């Protein structure tokens, strides 16, 4: 007997893997909407790059999407006209490509001050950098979302900030819940067993799950790029945990549906749902069927939970190992009227002619 | 004609150079009270180490002093009984000796939560670490003093925090005001010309000057220890700047007398003053007369300003190239009744017998 879930949302996906293959992997993982990161080549750090990327996504995407803009050392104060068309703004505050490297905390402040106040900001921030960006958010009187929290240190800092009523949310990736040192390159590095246990213990503090799908081939992992492929394995791993009583189905759906929607102001998808079989036990293979990454760090893990069918806006998009919607079926949700972020009137009545 | 100054205070001095030679250098630099750092060998990170260091200082010091305790990964919550006898608590948040290394921002939080709330905390914090420790201070609802601010990035962050009414103070060392890249190992690294200019432009943001006197020999600088010797050169450099109109005499005395007193609750020194000659032009030699460091990064700089006489508690302590008070003349100011930090009653009326 199948369980019907709403269309799940992954707010942290890297596609350079193209839009068509990445979104195929998404659908096979029971994900119907993705937010794609700006650290492409070239990176999405200005209006022309965003415009091109949006059209490429519209033509190649099989599920729905929004595209992030990336903060650079040169673009603060220049993105205001296109900001509302993006998922949000992403700051890369630790190791990154020179194009996205910020030289100084004053540059972080400039972004927080110039980016429209009603639109999302995500920060890749590890260890003390979480504390640093939280300070910038407070100084500029706005919210921030922290991605791939991986350490006890980080989740406890975020917990302390929430206890003081600060507007911070966060996400955790499956490899930081289901892999550790014992078990391999990724940023944030895999944590210790104590880090993993801390993340589970503090599940109440975690607002979202997101894959941080980063589809490098082994030839490229083995000057190592950070990241693991994860779109096809995320939901099966989490369903296994649900079936073991580690979290509830509702806990899962808050973190892969409701909280992504409300933090990023992502719209509902009409006639969209995912059917899963909670009974089927299987072993994760050396590589999953869809991602061009062609490897997975979860190889060998036993899981219970499989995506059987995905319906997206009234069409069968995925069934039992086959994706049935073509490249281009997917749409930019920021272009839907219900996908615009609500805003106070910034900041004709009497036509002359 | 001489100018009489009050007894100047250097709140950032490393003595392993012993107490007698370091305090001789202090007096020759017109400094009558020093706060000595805990990064000795062994470090001052527990009650027995503090007790021994206090007696060694009492026996060797030629000027008055207070000793910092150092935060470790093991001593949070253990220092409460001796905390009030120290200058304050110092956290080393960037590169340091393993003994003083803190593994996680949660350890910083633990120190901020456990150290008595009415007593000083100083943090060595560079670049984003300044933002991180400021966040910890806000989360724990208390003040923090940041040492050796060296970069435009850092002083502007502190300026922004002050504009939001946050309880933060800071200090700047002379090498960060009078040397730059152009001109050599030290932490914080020497800044660019733009960093130096930013510090001068934002003098209003700087609460204290302090030497960060770190008396390594060249044999040890040339696994490089961070720091420069600076006790004997600090005041002459700053007097030169005063004579050039870069800051006023009052600006200088706020930063080397009044603000050190009020941030660290250091007591007045009775019958104590420093006489300086503002007319004498001289060139800083390859090494100053007193410090065992036996070198100086300011070699070759022309200065105008010389310490002629220092009187400490009614005795002539220094005159024209000779220190006249013996090792042991100096006292622990935290033992003076006026040197205790005021505190609400924590936290006999009816004798039984």
XYZ file of C-alpha atoms in Angstrom:
706
model
C 0.000 0.000 0.000
C 1.379 3.343 -1.074
C 1.640 6.540 0.908
C 0.802 9.819 -0.807
C 3.108 12.740 -0.010
C 2.955 16.322 -1.241
C 5.489 17.488 -3.820
C 8.802 17.672 -1.971
C 11.182 20.597 -2.342
C 14.995 20.506 -2.308
C 16.292 24.011 -1.648
C 19.981 23.158 -2.290
C 20.895 21.586 -5.640
C 23.920 22.152 -7.898
C 23.488 21.631 -11.620
C 26.375 22.663 -13.879
C 24.966 16.988 -14.799
C 22.736 19.433 -16.687
C 19.256 20.714 -15.936
C 17.647 17.706 -17.653
C 19.694 15.005 -15.904
C 19.711 16.718 -12.498
C 15.937 17.184 -12.522
C 15.475 13.591 -13.664
C 17.437 12.589 -10.569
C 15.214 14.926 -8.521
C 11.984 13.319 -9.753
C 13.371 9.831 -9.135
C 14.064 11.010 -5.571
C 10.470 12.199 -5.111
C 11.423 15.858 -5.441
C 9.145 18.075 -7.574
C 10.802 21.475 -7.054
C 14.471 22.450 -6.738
C 16.398 25.580 -5.934
C 19.541 25.636 -8.020
C 22.783 27.171 -6.787
C 24.724 29.969 -8.567
C 28.205 28.383 -8.400
C 28.062 27.283 -12.021
C 30.595 28.061 -14.764
C 30.269 30.892 -15.321
C 28.626 31.728 -11.989
C 25.222 33.379 -11.658
C 26.455 36.694 -10.291
C 24.842 39.260 -12.573
C 21.648 39.934 -14.522
C 22.843 38.595 -17.908
C 24.066 35.358 -16.337
C 20.781 34.891 -14.488
C 18.761 35.584 -17.642
C 20.676 32.964 -19.616
C 20.539 30.416 -16.824
C 16.771 30.936 -16.491
C 16.217 30.168 -20.169
C 18.518 27.139 -20.098
C 16.586 25.846 -17.052
C 13.224 26.506 -18.700
C 14.342 24.467 -21.714
C 16.014 21.618 -19.828
C 14.296 21.262 -16.448
C 11.891 18.335 -15.970
C 10.647 19.505 -12.558
C 9.958 23.043 -11.347
C 12.694 25.306 -10.047
C 13.980 28.656 -8.820
C 17.527 29.913 -9.388
C 19.716 31.566 -6.746
C 21.893 34.576 -7.389
C 25.396 34.461 -5.938
C 27.017 37.251 -3.956
C 30.360 38.489 -5.267
C 32.937 41.061 -4.256
C 31.601 43.378 -7.008
C 27.821 42.943 -7.206
C 26.396 44.338 -3.948
C 23.905 47.083 -4.792
C 23.581 46.014 -8.438
C 21.024 43.176 -8.215
C 17.922 45.079 -7.068
C 16.046 44.976 -10.365
C 16.376 41.189 -10.799
C 16.507 40.120 -7.148
C 12.805 39.246 -6.949
C 13.108 36.886 -9.912
C 15.634 34.709 -8.029
C 15.142 32.077 -5.311
C 17.300 34.267 -3.092
C 20.898 35.426 -2.635
C 23.621 32.998 -1.616
C 26.828 33.977 0.188
C 29.746 31.553 0.075
C 31.593 32.448 3.279
C 34.123 29.623 3.465
C 36.138 27.863 0.711
C 34.953 28.705 -2.842
C 35.746 29.716 -6.409
C 37.442 33.090 -6.589
C 34.376 34.527 -8.345
C 32.227 34.000 -5.244
C 34.919 34.721 -2.670
C 34.120 37.641 -0.353
C 37.264 39.398 0.947
C 35.899 40.879 4.148
C 32.993 40.780 6.589
C 32.244 44.350 5.435
C 31.329 42.832 2.061
C 28.873 40.532 3.835
C 27.392 43.575 5.516
C 27.090 45.401 2.196
C 25.110 42.481 0.762
C 22.847 42.304 3.791
C 22.265 46.071 3.522
C 21.634 46.206 -0.232
C 19.774 42.964 -1.064
C 16.055 43.630 -0.772
C 15.048 43.112 2.846
C 12.015 40.920 2.044
C 13.978 38.392 -0.033
C 15.903 35.293 1.158
C 19.577 35.178 1.979
C 21.374 31.866 2.414
C 24.899 31.582 3.784
C 27.322 28.709 3.498
C 28.917 29.154 6.884
C 30.911 26.608 8.874
C 32.025 26.590 12.498
C 32.658 30.136 13.776
C 31.525 31.565 10.455
C 27.966 30.685 11.584
C 28.448 33.001 14.571
C 30.006 35.690 12.348
C 27.179 35.742 9.803
C 24.584 35.694 12.565
C 26.213 38.857 13.913
C 26.010 40.512 10.481
C 22.335 39.538 10.255
C 21.677 41.142 13.648
C 23.640 44.287 12.790
C 21.584 44.665 9.609
C 18.331 43.692 11.385
C 17.277 40.787 9.151
C 16.997 37.041 8.862
C 19.446 34.486 7.509
C 19.268 30.833 6.477
C 22.349 28.717 7.172
C 23.147 25.817 4.939
C 24.731 22.477 5.552
C 24.971 22.516 9.257
C 27.146 19.459 9.935
C 28.626 19.828 13.425
C 27.487 19.715 17.040
C 29.165 23.143 17.378
C 27.012 24.622 14.635
C 23.608 23.217 15.607
C 24.117 24.293 19.241
C 25.035 27.824 18.178
C 21.889 27.986 16.045
C 19.857 26.537 18.926
C 21.199 29.266 21.239
C 20.324 31.954 18.674
C 16.773 30.608 18.330
C 16.389 30.597 22.124
C 17.174 34.319 22.036
C 14.440 34.843 19.428
C 16.816 35.595 16.530
C 15.506 35.094 12.965
C 17.699 32.252 11.780
C 16.783 29.033 10.023
C 18.953 26.152 8.871
C 19.203 23.031 6.775
C 21.000 19.726 7.129
C 22.069 17.342 4.342
C 21.554 13.564 4.483
C 25.259 12.714 4.439
C 25.607 14.637 7.696
C 22.793 12.567 9.234
C 23.750 9.149 7.860
C 27.542 9.188 7.429
C 30.464 10.104 9.657
C 34.231 9.883 9.977
C 34.055 6.138 10.651
C 32.830 5.656 7.069
C 34.813 10.792 1.303
C 35.601 14.434 0.543
C 32.868 16.999 1.090
C 32.353 20.465 2.549
C 31.238 20.590 5.248
C 33.581 17.640 5.898
C 31.831 14.586 7.246
C 31.435 15.002 11.001
C 32.294 12.703 13.879
C 29.838 10.200 15.353
C 29.216 12.809 18.075
C 28.376 15.420 15.417
C 25.837 13.090 13.809
C 24.292 12.206 17.173
C 24.056 15.917 18.020
C 22.174 16.653 14.808
C 19.639 13.893 15.571
C 19.292 14.978 19.219
C 18.612 18.515 18.013
C 16.209 17.664 15.181
C 13.834 20.320 16.596
C 16.411 22.954 15.589
C 16.653 21.749 11.966
C 14.176 23.620 9.723
C 14.914 21.899 6.406
C 16.539 18.909 4.842
C 18.253 19.594 1.516
C 20.549 17.395 -0.505
C 23.396 19.767 -1.404
C 23.387 17.636 -4.537
C 26.822 18.242 -6.028
C 27.182 15.898 -9.031
C 30.952 15.617 -9.478
C 32.250 12.413 -11.112
C 34.786 10.333 -9.181
C 37.305 11.377 -11.823
C 36.795 14.893 -10.447
C 36.530 13.991 -6.745
C 39.652 11.826 -6.998
C 42.146 19.845 -6.184
C 38.996 18.069 -4.932
C 35.621 19.761 -5.484
C 33.384 19.717 -2.395
C 30.133 17.742 -2.493
C 28.269 14.473 -3.002
C 25.425 13.432 -5.283
C 22.265 12.981 -3.216
C 18.957 13.690 -4.974
C 18.082 10.027 -5.545
C 19.144 8.826 -2.101
C 17.785 11.567 0.176
C 14.191 10.472 0.519
C 14.896 6.715 0.745
C 17.406 7.383 3.555
C 14.931 9.577 5.441
C 12.026 7.151 4.948
C 14.206 4.437 6.461
C 14.712 6.656 9.513
C 10.973 7.286 9.701
C 10.234 3.543 9.549
C 12.731 3.090 12.423
C 11.003 5.749 14.529
C 13.933 8.201 14.448
C 11.578 10.937 13.286
C 7.936 11.018 12.233
C 6.446 11.321 8.770
C 5.242 14.788 9.744
C 8.770 15.701 10.902
C 10.001 14.699 7.447
C 7.306 16.662 5.603
C 7.891 19.813 7.654
C 11.534 19.637 6.584
C 11.081 18.704 2.898
C 7.860 20.591 2.136
C 6.350 23.115 4.550
C 9.477 24.825 5.876
C 11.112 25.118 2.430
C 7.864 26.706 1.183
C 7.642 29.251 3.989
C 11.312 30.238 4.297
C 11.754 30.692 0.561
C 8.188 31.792 -0.260
C 7.863 28.989 -2.772
C 4.420 28.474 -4.252
C 2.196 25.391 -4.116
C 2.287 23.039 -7.075
C -1.198 22.139 -8.226
C -2.071 18.456 -8.805
C 1.353 17.375 -7.615
C 2.215 14.445 -5.357
C 4.598 11.618 -4.686
C 3.663 8.017 -3.953
C 6.115 5.950 -1.921
C 6.292 2.324 -0.800
C 7.487 2.070 2.772
C 7.832 -1.711 2.752
C 10.425 -2.377 0.030
C 13.882 -3.116 1.431
C 16.844 -2.545 -0.864
C 20.560 -1.850 -0.859
C 21.984 1.366 -2.308
C 24.137 0.379 -5.329
C 27.521 1.721 -6.434
C 25.699 4.410 -8.415
C 22.088 5.551 -8.736
C 20.330 5.332 -12.115
C 19.939 9.018 -13.069
C 22.643 11.367 -11.815
C 25.590 11.778 -14.155
C 27.791 11.723 -11.023
C 27.759 7.960 -11.427
C 28.759 7.250 -7.852
C 27.322 7.564 -4.344
C 28.825 7.720 -0.836
C 25.829 5.737 0.478
C 26.794 2.610 -1.487
C 26.015 -0.456 0.617
C 23.538 1.107 3.051
C 20.294 -0.823 3.503
C 17.184 1.296 3.141
C 13.453 0.739 3.377
C 11.432 3.144 1.301
C 11.125 3.683 -2.438
C 9.622 6.301 -4.680
C 7.037 4.565 -6.896
C 5.245 7.412 -8.692
C 5.535 11.182 -9.028
C 2.796 13.303 -10.526
C 3.728 16.891 -11.398
C 1.003 19.364 -12.343
C -1.279 16.584 -13.556
C 1.254 14.540 -15.539
C 2.968 11.333 -14.525
C 6.576 12.504 -14.253
C 8.213 9.375 -12.800
C 7.197 5.801 -12.349
C 9.324 2.866 -11.187
C 12.683 3.681 -12.708
C 11.480 5.766 -15.664
C 11.160 9.526 -15.968
C 8.325 10.331 -18.334
C 8.301 14.151 -18.590
C 10.639 15.693 -21.197
C 13.314 18.338 -20.736
C 11.504 21.656 -20.600
C 8.433 20.420 -18.746
C 9.725 22.246 -15.676
C 8.942 25.890 -14.957
C 10.471 28.817 -13.075
C 8.216 29.157 -10.044
C 9.243 32.776 -9.490
C 7.344 33.622 -12.681
C 4.059 32.240 -11.292
C 1.863 34.952 -9.782
C 1.703 32.962 -6.565
C 5.520 32.599 -6.676
C 6.358 36.282 -6.238
C 7.541 37.236 -2.748
C 4.987 39.526 -1.059
C 6.360 43.005 -0.476
C 5.162 46.329 0.910
C 4.651 48.872 -1.856
C 8.134 50.315 -2.435
C 9.314 52.640 -1.182
C -1.862 55.557 -13.155
C -3.363 57.744 -10.422
C -3.435 60.907 -12.530
C -2.646 60.142 -16.182
C -1.228 63.041 -18.195
C -1.297 62.821 -21.981
C 60.139 72.394 29.053
C 58.659 69.112 30.182
C 55.077 67.949 30.008
C 53.625 66.072 32.968
C 51.420 63.090 32.117
C 49.566 60.737 34.439
C 50.889 57.208 34.919
C 50.203 55.416 31.642
C 48.769 51.911 31.497
C 49.564 49.181 28.956
C 46.821 46.562 29.083
C 48.590 44.072 26.755
C 52.104 42.932 27.696
C 53.756 39.503 27.410
C 56.476 38.622 29.887
C 57.759 35.037 29.877
C 62.240 38.830 29.126
C 61.238 38.365 32.771
C 59.126 40.508 35.063
C 62.132 42.661 36.020
C 63.375 43.347 32.481
C 59.905 43.748 30.954
C 58.837 46.248 33.613
C 62.122 48.112 33.219
C 61.227 48.460 29.542
C 57.744 49.619 30.600
C 59.087 52.380 32.858
C 61.515 53.532 30.165
C 58.466 53.795 27.882
C 56.588 55.958 30.400
C 54.309 53.111 31.451
C 53.624 52.708 35.196
C 51.119 49.827 35.137
C 50.922 46.727 32.932
C 48.483 43.910 32.407
C 50.420 40.744 31.730
C 49.129 38.013 29.434
C 48.620 34.338 30.435
C 50.359 32.728 27.428
C 53.495 31.995 29.421
C 55.210 28.616 29.853
C 53.433 27.072 31.554
C 50.328 29.144 30.805
C 48.232 30.861 33.467
C 45.155 28.675 33.104
C 44.442 27.533 36.651
C 44.588 28.725 40.258
C 48.010 27.237 41.132
C 49.600 28.752 38.030
C 48.092 32.154 38.789
C 49.240 31.995 42.417
C 52.823 31.248 41.400
C 52.845 33.866 38.671
C 51.506 36.474 41.116
C 54.354 35.837 43.546
C 56.982 35.848 40.794
C 55.565 39.191 39.569
C 55.493 40.635 43.086
C 59.170 39.737 43.491
C 60.359 40.834 40.048
C 58.081 43.637 38.843
C 59.442 47.204 38.933
C 56.117 48.832 38.006
C 52.599 47.870 39.085
C 50.634 45.135 37.366
C 47.632 42.836 37.072
C 47.779 39.316 35.630
C 45.278 37.855 33.158
C 43.919 34.343 33.356
C 43.749 32.418 30.091
C 40.731 30.483 28.869
C 41.336 26.827 28.032
C 39.301 23.924 26.727
C 39.131 22.529 30.298
C 38.835 25.460 32.713
C 35.409 27.035 32.094
C 33.457 27.011 35.356
C 36.552 26.384 37.495
C 37.983 29.911 37.885
C 35.230 31.593 39.923
C 37.083 31.710 43.232
C 40.207 33.382 41.787
C 38.638 35.331 38.919
C 38.420 38.605 40.852
C 42.139 38.503 41.627
C 43.006 38.603 37.898
C 43.068 41.498 35.414
C 40.443 39.593 33.449
C 40.004 36.501 31.273
C 41.656 36.249 27.874
C 40.396 34.078 25.011
C 42.820 33.231 22.217
C 40.441 32.661 19.303
C 42.889 32.438 16.408
C 46.369 30.833 16.172
C 47.832 29.821 19.574
C 49.570 27.260 21.764
C 47.548 24.086 22.121
C 47.035 24.840 25.824
C 44.979 27.943 25.011
C 43.305 26.598 21.883
C 39.498 26.499 22.073
C 37.983 23.744 19.886
C 34.544 25.205 19.299
C 32.455 28.363 19.576
C 30.442 26.484 22.232
C 33.572 26.646 24.401
C 33.619 30.421 23.938
C 30.002 30.499 25.031
C 30.767 28.390 28.099
C 33.451 30.879 29.150
C 31.162 33.844 28.597
C 28.462 32.086 30.652
C 30.684 30.977 33.541
C 33.235 33.795 33.997
C 31.824 36.271 36.495
C 29.650 38.737 34.608
C 31.182 41.849 36.227
C 34.774 40.975 35.282
C 36.648 41.746 32.024
C 36.921 39.445 29.054
C 39.419 40.127 26.283
C 39.430 38.246 22.990
C 42.199 37.940 20.451
C 39.982 37.875 17.403
C 40.944 38.611 13.804
C 38.817 39.249 10.732
C 35.510 37.341 10.909
C 36.402 36.060 14.361
C 35.611 39.603 15.599
C 32.064 39.165 14.280
C 31.847 35.654 15.772
C 32.909 36.683 19.278
C 30.635 39.712 19.165
C 27.760 37.312 18.495
C 28.742 35.180 21.503
C 28.880 38.321 23.654
C 25.365 39.272 22.531
C 24.005 35.757 23.061
C 25.395 35.788 26.604
C 24.311 39.416 27.188
C 27.687 40.899 28.159
C 30.566 43.053 27.034
C 33.802 42.128 25.293
C 37.116 43.860 24.619
C 38.821 43.045 21.321
C 42.558 43.169 21.086
C 44.918 44.093 18.327
C 42.525 45.373 15.793
C 44.751 45.734 12.720
C 42.500 45.837 9.651
C 40.004 48.176 8.013
C 37.602 45.192 8.069
C 37.880 44.861 11.832
C 37.608 48.517 12.861
C 34.552 49.000 10.612
C 32.837 45.957 12.109
C 33.488 47.324 15.599
C 32.274 50.760 14.484
C 29.032 49.195 13.205
C 28.560 47.332 16.503
C 29.071 50.539 18.501
C 26.533 52.340 16.296
C 24.016 49.677 17.326
C 24.793 50.353 21.000
C 26.596 47.041 21.624
C 29.027 46.856 24.579
C 32.314 46.342 22.783
C 35.637 48.088 23.230
C 38.926 47.626 21.412
C 42.627 48.327 21.358
C 45.173 48.973 18.641
C 48.945 48.392 18.794
C 51.522 50.907 17.532
C 52.903 48.643 14.808
C 49.441 48.627 13.246
C 49.403 52.443 13.260
C 52.991 53.078 12.160
C 53.990 50.106 9.985
C 52.443 48.347 7.009
C 53.138 45.836 4.261
C 55.409 48.298 2.447
C 57.854 48.033 5.366
C 58.234 41.449 9.846
C 56.215 38.561 11.275
C 53.441 39.368 13.725
C 49.849 38.418 14.500
C 47.780 40.243 13.534
C 49.980 40.410 10.411
C 50.997 43.914 9.462
C 48.169 45.472 7.462
C 48.149 47.258 4.128
C 48.539 51.025 3.777
C 44.733 51.128 3.465
C 44.384 49.244 6.769
C 46.639 51.748 8.532
C 44.792 54.709 7.013
C 41.474 53.175 8.100
C 42.656 52.868 11.693
C 43.683 56.552 11.750
C 40.444 57.662 10.053
C 38.503 55.731 12.686
C 40.498 56.831 15.740
C 37.163 57.672 17.432
C 36.395 53.930 17.454
C 39.684 52.972 19.155
C 39.287 52.862 22.963
C 42.853 51.947 23.937
C 46.383 51.780 22.697
C 48.384 48.820 24.002
C 51.764 47.543 22.934
C 51.172 43.791 22.607
C 54.772 43.723 23.786
C 55.975 40.276 22.753
C 59.719 40.107 23.523
C 60.958 37.321 21.245
C 64.627 37.484 20.177
C 65.393 37.542 16.450
C 66.843 34.066 16.931
C 63.270 33.050 17.777
C 61.468 35.218 15.200
C 63.835 34.023 12.467
C 57.918 28.100 13.514
C 57.784 31.886 14.049
C 56.240 33.207 17.278
C 53.820 36.103 16.723
C 54.691 39.535 18.115
C 57.052 42.500 18.355
C 58.740 44.248 21.264
C 57.102 47.638 21.807
C 57.076 48.970 25.379
C 59.961 51.403 24.857
C 58.807 52.660 21.463
C 55.048 53.053 21.971
C 54.920 56.427 23.653
C 57.665 58.071 21.550
C 55.839 56.984 18.368
C 52.516 58.341 19.636
C 54.043 61.611 20.879
C 55.476 62.112 17.401
C 51.962 61.736 15.985
C 50.642 64.204 18.549
C 53.338 66.748 17.636
C 52.291 66.314 13.973
C 48.630 66.954 14.800
C 47.463 63.423 13.922
C 45.750 63.178 17.296
C 45.660 65.383 20.380
C 47.399 64.927 23.707
C 43.987 64.287 25.245
C 43.258 61.659 22.563
C 46.485 59.931 23.594
C 45.716 60.090 27.322
C 42.187 58.742 26.874
C 43.730 55.742 25.122
C 46.724 55.118 27.425
C 45.203 56.135 30.767
C 41.485 56.814 31.198
C 39.984 54.108 28.987
C 42.334 51.374 30.265
C 41.343 52.382 33.818
C 37.607 52.261 33.166
C 37.406 49.150 30.971
C 39.593 47.086 33.277
C 38.619 48.766 36.567
C 42.245 49.547 37.283
C 42.908 51.764 40.276
C 44.642 55.148 40.406
C 48.311 55.198 41.319
C 49.033 57.789 43.973
C 51.938 60.228 43.447
C 52.630 58.789 40.018
C 53.476 60.672 36.830
C 55.581 60.751 33.718
C 57.559 63.713 32.417
C 58.232 63.866 28.684
C 60.195 66.182 26.399
C 58.290 66.871 23.213
C 61.143 68.694 21.494
C 63.914 66.075 21.298
C 64.224 64.507 17.847
C 65.883 61.106 17.627
C 66.102 58.002 15.482
C 64.969 54.608 16.772
C 68.084 52.369 16.927
C 68.486 48.708 15.972
C 67.446 47.772 19.510
C 66.108 49.662 22.524
C 68.122 49.723 25.763
C 65.965 47.598 28.104
C 63.959 44.821 26.470
C 65.762 41.502 26.226
C 64.196 41.167 22.748
C 67.211 43.104 21.529
C 65.600 44.188 18.287
C 62.802 46.467 17.082
C 60.700 46.678 13.902
C 60.708 50.491 14.213
C 64.469 50.724 13.606
C 65.193 53.824 11.533
C 61.975 55.749 12.197
C 62.456 59.370 13.248
C 60.527 60.338 16.352
C 60.047 63.473 18.407
C 59.238 62.800 22.022
C 61.218 61.237 24.851
C 60.463 60.002 28.323
C 62.669 61.970 30.744
C 61.399 60.998 34.206
C 58.912 58.574 35.738
C 57.793 58.815 39.334
C 55.915 55.806 40.721
C 54.182 56.063 44.092
C 56.560 58.785 45.252
C 59.847 57.264 44.068
C 61.876 58.180 41.019
C 61.551 54.998 38.960
C 63.220 56.102 35.708
C 65.346 58.997 34.654
C 67.159 59.519 31.348
C 68.213 56.002 30.467
C 68.373 54.556 33.991
C 65.753 52.596 35.895
C 66.145 53.286 39.590
C 63.507 51.097 41.294
C 64.536 47.494 42.070
C 62.823 44.259 41.086
C 59.947 43.811 43.499
C 59.040 47.483 43.809
C 55.957 46.752 41.714
C 52.663 45.605 43.212
C 49.594 43.622 42.168
C 46.927 46.296 41.815
C 44.116 43.769 42.232
C 45.200 43.423 45.866
C 44.662 47.146 46.558
C 41.258 47.863 48.094
C 40.591 50.359 45.328
C 41.680 47.718 42.769
C 38.860 45.248 43.409
C 36.122 45.247 40.766
C 32.840 46.530 42.252
C 30.181 43.839 42.368
C 26.607 43.438 43.579
C 26.444 41.307 46.711
C 26.449 37.728 45.393
C 24.161 36.082 44.743
C 27.620 37.890 60.915
C 23.941 38.876 60.999
C 22.981 36.344 63.669
C 26.076 34.731 65.208
C 25.541 31.291 66.741
C 28.154 29.953 69.142
